[PDB]
A paper describes a structure:
Mitochondrial ribosomes (mitoribosomes) synthesize proteins encoded within the mitochondrial genome that are assembled into oxidative phosphorylation complexes. Biogenesis of the mitoribosome requires trans-acting assembly factors that chaperone rRNA folding and guide mito r-protein incorporation. Here we used cryo-electron microscopy to determine nine structures of native yeast and human mitoribosomal small subunit assembly intermediates, illuminating the mechanistic basis for how GTPases are used to control early steps of decoding centre formation, how initial rRNA folding and processing events are mediated, and how mitoribosomal proteins have active roles during assembly. Furthermore, this series of intermediates from two species with divergent mitoribosomal architecture uncovers both conserved principles and species-specific adaptations that govern the maturation of mitoribosomal small subunits in eukaryotes.
Using cryo-EM, we identified six discrete assembly states (A, B, C, D, E and C*) of the human mtSSU through global and focused classification strategies and solved their structures to resolutions ranging from 2.4 to 3 Å. Upon the departure of MCAT in state E, h42 can become ordered in the position previously occupied by MCAT and h31 can adopt a compact conformation forming contacts with h34, h42 and h43. Thus, dissociation of MCAT triggers global compaction of the 3′ major domain. In human states E and C*, access of h31 to the decoding centre is blocked by assembly factor METTL17, a mechanism that is also present in the yeast system, with the METTL17 homologue Rsm22 performing the same function. Although we did not observe a bound methyl donor in the enzyme, we did observe methylated target residues in states following dissociation of TFB1M (states D and E). Maturation events downstream of state E subsequently link RBFA and late-stage assembly factor METTL15 function during mitoribosome assembly with mtIF3-mediated translation initiation.
Author numbering:
A (entry chain M): 10 to 124
B (entry chain T): 2 to 165
C (entry chain O): 48 to 237
D (entry chain 0): 165 to 216
E (entry chain D): 190 to 229, 239 to 430
F (entry chain 0): 6 to 55
G (entry chain R): 66 to 356
H (entry chain N): 4 to 112
The structure:
Amino acid sequence: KAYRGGHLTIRLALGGCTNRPFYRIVAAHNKCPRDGRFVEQLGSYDPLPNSHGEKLVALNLDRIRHWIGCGAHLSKPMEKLLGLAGFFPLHPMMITNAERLRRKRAREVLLASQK
Amino acid sequence: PMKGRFPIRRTLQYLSQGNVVFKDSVKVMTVNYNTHGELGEGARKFVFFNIPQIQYKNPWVQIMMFKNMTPSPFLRFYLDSGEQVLVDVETKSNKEIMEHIRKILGKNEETLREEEEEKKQLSHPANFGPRKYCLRECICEVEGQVPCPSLVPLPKEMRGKYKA
Amino acid sequence: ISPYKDEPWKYLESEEYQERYGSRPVWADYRRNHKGGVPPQRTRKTCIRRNKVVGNPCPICRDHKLHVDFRNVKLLEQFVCAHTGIIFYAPYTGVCVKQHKRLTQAIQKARDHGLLIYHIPQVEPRDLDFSTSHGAVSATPPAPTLVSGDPWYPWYNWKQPPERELSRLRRLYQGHLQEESGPPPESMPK
Amino acid sequence: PYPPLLRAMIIAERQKNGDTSTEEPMLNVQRIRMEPWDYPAKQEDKGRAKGT
Amino acid sequence: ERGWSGNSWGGISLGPPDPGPCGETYEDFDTRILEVRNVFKSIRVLVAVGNGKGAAGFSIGKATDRMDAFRKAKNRAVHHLHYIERYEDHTIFHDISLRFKRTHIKMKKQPKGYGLRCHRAIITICRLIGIKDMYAKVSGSINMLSLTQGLFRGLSRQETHQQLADKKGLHVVEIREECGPLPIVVASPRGPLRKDPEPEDEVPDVKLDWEDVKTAQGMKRSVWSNLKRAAT
Amino acid sequence: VRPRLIAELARRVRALREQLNRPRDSQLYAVDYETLTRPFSGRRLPVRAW
Amino acid sequence: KKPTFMDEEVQSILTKMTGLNLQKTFKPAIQELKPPTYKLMTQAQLEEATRQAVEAAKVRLKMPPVLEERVPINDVLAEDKILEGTETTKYVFTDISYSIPHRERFIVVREPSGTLRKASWEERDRMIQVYFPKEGRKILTPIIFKEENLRTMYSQDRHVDVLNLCFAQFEPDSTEYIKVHHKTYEDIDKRGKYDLLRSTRYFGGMVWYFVNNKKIDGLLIDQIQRDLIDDATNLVQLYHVLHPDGQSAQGAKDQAAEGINLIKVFAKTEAQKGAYIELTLQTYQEALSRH
Amino acid sequence: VRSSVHARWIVGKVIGTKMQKTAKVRVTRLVLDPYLLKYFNKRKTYFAHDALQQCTVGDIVLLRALPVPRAKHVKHELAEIVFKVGKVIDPVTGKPCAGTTYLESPLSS
Amino acid sequence: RKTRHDPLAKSKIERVNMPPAVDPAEFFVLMERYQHYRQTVRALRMEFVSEVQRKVHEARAGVLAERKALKDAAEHR
RNA sequence: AUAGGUUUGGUCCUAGCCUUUCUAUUAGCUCUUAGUAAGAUUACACAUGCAAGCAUCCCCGUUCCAGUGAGUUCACCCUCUAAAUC
Ligand code: FES
Ligand SMILES: [K+]
Ligand SMILES: [K+]
Ligand SMILES: [Mg+2]
Ligand SMILES: [Mg+2]
Ligand SMILES: [Mg+2]
Ligand SMILES: [Mg+2]
Ligand SMILES: [Mg+2]
Ligand SMILES: [Mg+2]
Ligand SMILES: [Zn+2]
C-alpha cells in the first residue's frame, strides 16, 4: 500500500481487554492504524504490576537500533520508556514532571504544617 | 486402493524424503534416457522414482525429459553462469546417480542447517500475536501477570466503571 | 453425610466399596441415555441442581461416598489412562462437566504434590556455555558522574536562568504570565 | 557521556573482545550544531496556499 | 441391560451355552446376539459365543420359536469354535484388509489403551474373542452375516511373529518410540538363522489405501471421525 | 485495461486552470485589521500574532 | 592441580562406575503411544542395532556439569535521584535480541527510587522464562520442591524424578538446584538407595558429592554387597586423588595397597564405619572362595 | 540485476518458424497436481530471437533472457541448439547418432 | 474523522484558542533541556545509522564474505 | 463415520433420501446476578447534533484515522526507479 509521504515510527500498539491494557512496541508506518499492519514487533510492555510488583518491558535493542539507523522516528511514550531503561537520556518532560510533582507535594506539606 | 504401480511415490512423505537441494546456479535439468536396454536400467529407475523428489525439493528448476534420442542415457544441468554440467549415467544405479548429483550440485548439510537456523530467527518466541505467527496472544497468558478479565474479573478498584 | 469426608481414601479400602464395585472402575457400569448412535460431544453440565439429583447421575454423583480430593489418589487413578498418562475426556467415563473439572483439578494438584506418579522427561540444559564473566552479570565500571554523585547529564539538575533572559520571556508573554517558579525541592517531599 | 545502559553494553562488548582499556566511551557532539528554532528556513522549499 | 438400541436384539447376552451332549461345560463362554430376522413365519438368529481367551465362534439358528432358535444357534456355535491369535493378548498381530462377498473390512493393530473403535458388531465379537485394542472400518455392503464371516476369516488367517520368524528364518525385532532405539526381539527362528540379510527394498510395491494416506496427510476433513465416545 | 481518459483530461484542465488563476500575494496575505482574519479564506490569525 | 569434575580421567571413572543398563535407560515411557514397527534382522544386524542403542544410551547418560553456587548480582548502573518518588513500582527491562546467550543478555531494573541496577539472578531467570519459555520450566517455583513434597517423593523412591524436575526448573549453579540435589543425595545416603541412580546421568554428581564430603562408606558397602569390586576400587582411587594428603592415601602408598587392599587401607584409615566395611569385604571374599 | 525477464534460462522445442528472425518455442515444466500428487507437464510458449534463422520445427533449443524485451512477446534469444532435429550429436561420445543407434562408431576415432 | 470537504460546525465559528500561560523560569530551563536532549539523541541516531551502513557494507563486499564467496567458487570448480 | 432407518412375499446387490454430530441466523415459549467478547437485512432515503485543527501571520494537516462490500484476478515475487524518513 502506497501512502502519501509518511515514515516509519516505533510506537506502542494497544491490545489486551477492557480495563486490562497491554502494549506491543512495533515499528510501523505512521499513517497506519494503531493496532493494524506493522513492519516488525520490537518488544512489549505490560503496564499493570504483576504478582511481583513489576512492570515488564521487553526491548529488542538490536532491531530497535537497526530501525533507528534506518530512519524510523519515535513516539514520545517510547522515548520515555527508553529513557527509563537507560537506553536514552531521560526525556526533558520526565524531569520537568518530577520537579512539578516535587513542588506540588511541597505545597501540600506546607499546608499540613500551616494547619 | 490407490491407483498405479508404486503408489507410495504419490505421497508427501516420499516426495519430501529426497535429499537433493540444488545450488542456486542450477536452472534447467535435462534427462536423456532410453526406454529399453539393460545398461540404462538405473536411468529409467531414476526417472521413475527420483525425478518427483528432485522436482519437489526444487520447484523453480525446469526439469525436462527426452526419450530414445541418444544411444546412452545422460543428465545435463544448465547453470546461471552459462556453464553446462554433463553427467553420464549409463551402468549406474538410480541411487548412484542421486548421490553423484547431490555431491556435485547439491547443497551440503551445513548450508541447509544454516538456512534452517535463519528461518528460526523470524519466529521470535518473545513476540505476541495471533497463533498463526506467535506462541502467545496476550501477556495475560503468562503466569504471574494480571489475568484476562474474560476469565477472572478484575478488582473493582481497577475498573473504570468504579473509578468514575 | 459421609463418614469418609475427612479421609476419603479410606472409602476405597472399605468392604462396602469392594462389594459395590469390586475391582472394576467406578464408571465401568455407567451408560449414557441419548438419541442416535453418536452421542452428544459433551456431558451434562451437572447431575445435582439445587441439591436435587437427576434421574441418571454420573458415576461420581451417583455415589456420595466418592470424594474428588487430591489425597484420594486411588480414585483419581481410575480417570487417567494407565498406559498413556492422559485424563479421559468426560464422554469416555460419562462424568458430568462439573465433576470432570473437579477431577482434572484434583489430578493436577495430586501430581503437583508428588502423590500421583506421572512421566517426567529428561530435558537438555538451557545454555551451552555457563560462563558468568560477561558484563551483563558481572560488575560494570562506574561512570565518573556516578562516582562523584552528580547526575548523568548536567541538565538533569535545575539551573536558575539569568535575570535578563527571564526579563525577555516576561516581555514576550505580556499578560499571559504565570508566577515564576523557583528551584525545585532537592529531595522528594514526604 | 553515553546513556547508562548503552555505556554498560559498550564496555561489556569491549571486555568480551579482549579490550581492557579504561577510557570512558564518549559521544562526539561537535558535529551536532544546534540551530535555533527561529533560524530562517528555506523559502524556496515552502509551499503556497491554493486558490479557492 | 439393553443391546445396541432399546428395541434391538443385537448385543443382548444369551448366557453361557448349555452343557453339550459330549459331556463338556461352557460356563466360561459368553453368548451375544448379532442378528434376528423374520423368515417368511419362522425366526433366523445369528449369534456369537466366546470365552474371552481366543476361543470364539458363531452360528445361525432357525426355528418357529425365538427361544428355540437362540438355543440352537448357541449350542451349534460352541461346536464350531475358532481360535484367534492375539498379540500380547490385547490386539491383532498386523493390519488385515479383507473382502468377503461385497463387504470390505480394514482392521488395524493399535497400542494398549486405544480401545475398540470398530463397528458395533465387530466390537461385540472382539469382546467375545478377547481383543481389547483395534481399529476397524467396514465398507461396501454392511451385511451382518458377511461381516461376521469375513471378520472370523481374517482373524483366523493372521500370521504371528513366531510364524513369520520361522518362515523367514530371521529375528523379528520390535521398535517402539516410547522405548527409544532399544531393539526388542519378539520372535526368533526355532531352526537355524539365515546369515544373509533381507533385500533392502528401496521402495516396496505395496498397495496403499487412499483413506489412510488422506488421514496421514491431513486432507481428511470428516466431521464424524475422531468423535468423543463412551469407553468400549 | 479500459483506459480512463477523462481522469487525465480533468487533471490537465485542473492544472491549467490552477496555473492561470493563481491567487496573488495581495489576495492571499491581505488581512482585515478589525477582525484579524484573512478575507481570502476567512481564517483568523493566531492570538499571539494579533 | 586437583582434578575438576569434568576431567577426562574423572569422567571415565564415573562413567564406568555409573554402568549402562539398556533396559533401565530406555524404560517404556507413559506417554502417547503409537503402533510399534517391526524389522527382520540377522544376528549381525541385531548386534549392530544393539551397538547403536548403546551409543544412544551413552549420549543419554552424559553427566551434567557440577557448578559452584553463583555469586549474587549487586551492581548499580545509575542513580537518577530526580526520578525518586515519580513511580510506585519497579520497571524490569529485558533485552530480547534473539542471538544472545542468556548469561550475556542485559536485564536491568529501574527502582522507584530512580536507581537503574542490574537484575538479580532469580529475576534474570524469571524474565528468561517469560520471554524465552523452556519446556519443563515454570516462572513461579513449583511446590513440589517444598520439603514435605520432596519427602513424599523420596518415600515413593522417586529420587530420579526429583532430580529431573530440578534440572528442568533450576539452573545448575542456582542455590535451589544445589540445595535440592544435596537433599536428594543425603536421603539416598541415609536410606541406602544408590542403585536408584545407577545407569542415570545423576550418579556421577552423587558420587562427586559423597567424595568431596568424605562420606563414601555407604557407597563402598553397597558396591561390595553388589559384587562391583572394580567400582569400589575405582571409588577409593578417586577419593585418594581428590584427597592426596589424607592419611588413607599415605597409608596406601606406604603399604603399596592395590585392588582390594586399597579398600582395606581406606577402611582402616579414614572410614567412619570401617568395621562394617571390613565385615562386608570379608564376607565377599569368603563367598568368592566358596563359589 | 542482469535482466527484468523472469525466466533466465529455459529449454524448449521449436514449434514455429513462420516469423522473421523469431522462433516460437514450446517449454514444458513439471507441475504437481495438488490432489493426485503426481507431476504433469505444463506447457508455455516463448518467442526467441533467431537472428540467423537457423532454427527448424522440432529441434530442442536453449533460450536465454534478453536484458530487456525487444518486442511485445520476444523476451528471449536463442543461446544454442541443444538437439538439431534429426541431426543429433551424442554429447557423451561426440559422434552422430540416429535415435539409439550410432551413425559413426565411437571406436573409429 | 472529517474530510476537507465537510463544513465546520456552527457551534465553533466563534472559537478562539487562547494560548496557555507561561512560567518564565520553567520555560527557559525546559528550552535548555530539550536542546541538550535533542543534541544527544541526534548523536546517538548518527551512531546507529553508521552501524547500519557498516553492517550492510560488511555483508556486501565484506572480507569474511569475500572469503566465503571465493571458497564456494573454488569448491564449484 | 464405529455407523443406523427406509425398496421385496422373501434373500443378495446397487442406489438415492433421511437419522445421529458441531456451528451461525431467525421464529415460538421461557429467562435471575456478575465479568468478557460480538452486534442494520438493505452501495435504499435521511431530520437533528457532533466527527480537523495547529500555529506569531507563512506553511503544515484536513490525501490519514473511521466506513462499506457495490464492482472485481490493480493485492504477491523479481527488474528498474520516483515521491517520503534518516
Ligand atoms: S486476551 Fe489478554 S487481556 Fe484479554
Ligand atoms: K502548522
Ligand atoms: K463486494
Ligand atoms: Mg427406547
Ligand atoms: Mg442405504
Ligand atoms: Mg468506528
Ligand atoms: Mg482503510
Ligand atoms: Mg456483489
Ligand atoms: Mg528520492
Ligand atoms: Zn455428575
